[PDB]
């Protein structure tokens, strides 16, 4: 899962962002324990 607890003292926003950058997003943030990406080109 993208989001957890030991996500670098967070939830999983940094991973979500970087991970989605690979796909084609310009941002990523974990909300409601779910990786929600933003800006899909």
From Swiss-Prot:
Please explain the role this protein plays, according to its UniProt record: Responsible for the anti Gram-positive activity of immune hemolymph.
User: What's this protein's name?
Assistant: Defensin
Which cysteines form disulfides? 3-30
- Lineage of source species: Eukaryota, Metazoa, Ecdysozoa, Arthropoda, Hexapoda
Q: What induces it?
A: By bacterial infection.
Q: Which gene encodes it?
A: Def1
Annotated organism of origin:
Anopheles gambiae (African malaria mosquito)
Q: Which family does it belong to?
A: Belongs to the invertebrate defensin family. Type 1 subfamily.
Record's subcellular location: Secreted
């Amino acid at each position: 899962a993208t989001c957890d607890l030991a996500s670098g003292f967070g939830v999983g926003s940094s991973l979500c962002a970087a991970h989605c950058l690979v796909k084609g997003y310009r941002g990523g943030y974990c909300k409601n324990k779910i990786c929600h990406c933003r800006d899909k080109f």
